[PDB]
């Protein structure tokens with residue numbers, strides 16, 4: 541029943557006593573760094589109220605609002621993945637699948653985990669314990685998207701590129717795997733819209749130009765090979781001005 545500002549304050553108090561000036565940032569740091577242990581019901585209710593208020597504060601971007609391109613059913617969205625109302629968003633995860641523990645990190649995993657909320661980290665832990673092993677590169681796992689406007693998250697782990705190294709055919713195809721696996725899973729889940737982030741191009745150091753070429757080529761080859769899934773709209777979600785320019789050059793050349 542507290543206000544959103546007051547909710548942040550109470551959540552911060554619970555997390556601080558259990559064991560950067562904007563309150564949202566302090567809260568985020570604390571929840572980010574928290575090992576994936578069970579969570580008080582009291583905390584979860586505050587966080588749920590907070591994320592519901594967050595949701596009430598914007599109108600999600602719809603698939604219709606995205607930019608069309610030269611290629612049928614491939615669309616472009618330049619913005620934060622947290623505001624996109626699609627069937628599934630693809631998270632560029634790590635192999636433990638537990639999200640990002642680095643406070644207020646600028647990666648998509650952190651943004652997705654923080655605003656989906658804490659039930660996502662707990663769900664991922666249960667999934668990964670059940671599995672009994674870390675995730676391999678280029679696979680796909682489906683979870684709910686919790687408080688996000690998307691319905692589902694598809695978690696995939698892309699390849700790292702050692703700094704200075706170029707993209708070999710193998711490493712190219714490891715990135716391609718993420719796209720193929722995510723598309724295959726979306727179809728099997730009966731979804732009709734999927735948003736990809738620029739997997740591997742942040743923390744994992746995959747060069748943006750090659751990554752965009754791979755992403756586009758892989759989705760187009762998949763569409764040609766999988767006629768059954770022409771019902772699927774794919775959105776490429778760019779977040780950096782460099783990615784915006786690359787995707788524009790490859791999908792919207794006149």
Ligand SMILES: Nc1ncnc2c1ncn2[C@@H]1O[C@H](COP(=O)(O)OP(=O)(O)OC[C@H]2O[C@H](O)[C@H](O)[C@@H]2O)[C@@H](O)[C@H]1O
Nearest residue numbers: 620621632634640647648649651738740741742743744779
């Ligand atoms: N809110 C956002 N919406 C859309 N795209 C975003 C957003 N935030 C970042 N991006 C873009 O998302 C893209 C991917 O950058 P990264 O998220 O580093 O993913 P990786 O696969 O390279 O690294 C994964 C590791 O880093 C994490 O800590 C994980 O836990 C793993 O340990 C870039 O284009 C970003 O600009």
Ligand SMILES: [Zn+2]
Nearest residue numbers: 640645647650
């Ligand atoms: Zn991170």
